[PDB]
C-alpha cells in the first residue's frame, strides 16, 4: 500500500470533493461554479467539466451507473447533471443548504442532506420526493448508504447522535450517541462523516476531535478506536475542514485516516498501528485534507489549503 500518482485539477478554488468515482475510471473534482473535471484514472488527463451552477459544490456522489452526477451546492438545489447529457433533471430542495449526498446500490432513489436537519429522499428517475425523515434539530452534516444494502440510512449530524433510518419512509429506525457533550461547548458535535463498512453491519463515526470510534448497530456497542501515538495533537476540529477517509477493502480491511491539519495516517484492520504515510506537507497538502474516497487500490485525496491536491495512490 505505497505509491503516488500524477496530480492536477487546475488549482483554482477550494478542493471540496475528490470522489473516487467507481466505474474504475473517471475521477472528478470541483472547481466551484466549474464542476467535475473528468480524469480517466488510467489516462490521467484532464477531460470534460460539467459546470452546473453558481455556488461552491460541497460533495459529489458517484452513481452506480456512472452516467449521471449529483453535486451539493449551498444555494437552492441539489443538482444532478448527466455526465454525457445536458443537466436535464435538477430539482428543488429543502430551503436549507444541502451538504452531503450518496446514492443507494440500485441507484434507484437518492438521499439529500440538510442544514435544517431534515433530510429528504428523492426518487431519481421520476424525479420527486417521498416523505421526509426529520429526526433532528441541528444540521445533518453527512449521509451515506452502504454497498450491499439500501435500508440502512446514516445520519451524521450536529445533534451529537447518530440516527439510523429505514429504507425509504420508515422514520427513525434506531439511534446511537457518542459521549461527553458538555466538554467543548453546549453539547459536543464530533460527528463529521459516517461512511459504512462494505458489509452493511458496521459504521464508522469519525470524531471531529480525530479519534475514530467505530461502532456496531447490531450490539449497540463500540468496537476498537484507532488512536495516534501523540496525545491531542490531532485535534483539528475547526481549521476549514471536516476531514474524513473511507475504508480500503483491498484484500484486508484498511482504514485510511481523515486527518486534518497533518499528513493523513493509515491504520490496520485490527491492530492500532500506523502505516505508510509520508511527511509530504510541502506538495499538495500544506495543512489539511478535505475529502478521501476509495474504490480499490486506487484511492484519491484532496486538500483544502493546498487547493486541488488531486491524488490517487497504489
Amino acid at each position: 500500500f505505497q505509491f503516488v500518482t500524477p496530480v492536477g485539477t487546475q488549482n483554482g478554488l477550494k478542493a471540496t470533493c475528490a470522489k473516487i468515482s467507481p466505474d474504475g475510471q473517471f475521477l472528478a473534482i470541483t472547481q466551484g461554479l466549474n464542476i467535475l473535471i473528468y480524469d480517466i484514472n488510467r489516462r490521467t488527463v484532464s477531460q470534460t467539466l460539467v459546470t452546473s451552477h453558481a455556488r461552491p459544490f460541497s460533495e459529489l456522489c458517484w452513481s452506480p451507473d456512472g452516467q449521471c452526477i449529483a453535486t451539493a451546492s449551498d444555494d437552492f438545489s441539489v443538482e444532478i447533471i448527466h455526465l454525457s447529457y445536458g443537466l436535464l433533471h435538477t430539482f428543488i430542495g429543502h430551503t436549507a443548504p444541502v451538504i452531503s449526498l450518496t446514492f443507494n446500490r440500485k441507484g434507484n432513489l437518492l438521499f439529500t442532506s440538510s442544514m435544517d436537519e431534515s433530510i429528504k429522499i428523492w426518487d431519481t428517475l421520476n424525479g420527486s420526493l417521498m416523505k421526509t425523515i426529520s429526526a433532528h434539530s441541528e444540521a445533518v452534516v453527512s449521509v451515506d448508504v452502504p454497498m450491499n444494502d439500501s435500508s440502512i440510512l446514516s445520519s451524521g449530524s450536529y445533534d451529537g447522535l447518530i440516527r439510523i433510518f429505514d429504507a425509504e419512509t420508515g422514520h427513525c429506525l434506531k439511534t446511537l450517541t457518542y459521549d461527553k457533550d458538555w466538554k467543548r461547548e453546549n453539547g459536543v458535535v464530533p460527528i463529521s462523516q459516517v461512511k459504512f463498512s462494505e458489509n452493511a453491519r458496521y459504521l464508522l463515526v469519525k470524531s471531529l476531535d480525530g479519534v475514530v470510534k467505530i461502532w456496531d448497530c447490531i450490539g449497540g456497542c463500540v468496537v476498537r478506536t484507532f488512536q495516534v501515538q501523540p496525545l491531542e495533537k490531532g485535534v483539528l476540529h475547526h481549521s476549514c475542514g471536516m476531514d474524513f477517509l473511507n475504508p480500503e477493502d483491498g484484500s484486508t480491511p484498511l482504514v485510511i485516516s481523515g486527518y486534518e491539519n497533518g499528513d493523513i495516517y493509515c491504520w490496520n484492520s485490527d491492530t492500532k498501528s500506523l502505516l505508510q504515510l509520508l511527511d509530504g506537507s510541502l506538495y499538495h497538502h500544506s495543512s489539511p485534507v478535505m475529502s478521501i474516497h476509495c474504490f480499490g487500490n486506487i484511492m484519491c485525496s484532496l486538500a483544502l489549503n493546498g487547493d486541488c491536491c488531486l491524488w490517487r495512490w497504489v
Binding site: T48, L49, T51, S84, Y85, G86
Partner: protein, 215 residues
Amino acid sequence: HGREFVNDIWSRLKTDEDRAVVKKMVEQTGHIDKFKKFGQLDFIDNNIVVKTDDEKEIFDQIVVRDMTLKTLEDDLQEVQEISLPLFKKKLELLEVYLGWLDNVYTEMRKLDDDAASHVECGKEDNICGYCSTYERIPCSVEEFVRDFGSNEEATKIHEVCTKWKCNRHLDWVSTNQEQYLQQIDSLESMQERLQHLIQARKKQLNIQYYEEILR
C-alpha cells in the same frame, strides 16, 4: 453627438467587467447609428477589452449553439475534441433506425395489404383466413378465384390455417397492422426524442471545446 455621449456612458459603464448586458444595451438603444462606438473603440481598448473585440461581431451573443470555430489557430482546432468518437458512434445507429429499419417496417406493413386482398377475394368467392402466410408473401396459388374452388375446401394452395370460420387461431390477420402501426409509432417517437437528444448533445458539445480553448 448625443450619440457620442451615449456611446461614452455605455462605454464607461463597463470598466473591464462582464458588460454583455451592456452589450445588449448597445444594440437596444440608438440602434440606427453604430459608427461612434468604433470611433471610441479607436482608444477605449482599456475599459472594455472583451467587448472591444466583441464590437466587431454580430449583435446576437447570448445563444448556446453553433458551427465549430473558424479561428483556425491550428489543425481543426485540435480536431474538435477528436471529432466526437462517442456521439457519432452512438447515434449513427439513429440514422440506421431513421432510414433503413423504418423503411423495412413500412414495407412489412405494406405487404399485408396484398395479403389481405388475396384473402378478401377468396372470401368473396365463409372460412377464416389465417395468419402466418404473408411471411415471404407466397400466397401459394395459381388462380385463386378458382384454385380455392369447391374441389378442395381447406385451402390446399395459399394455405391459411382455418377449416371454416374457426376460432382456433383467433386470427390476428385482421388488425395485425396495429402491431406494425404501434411499431412504427415507436419508431417515430424514438426518432423525435433522439433528435432532441442530438440537440442536447450539441448543447453539451459546444461547451466542451469552448472550455478546452481556455484549457
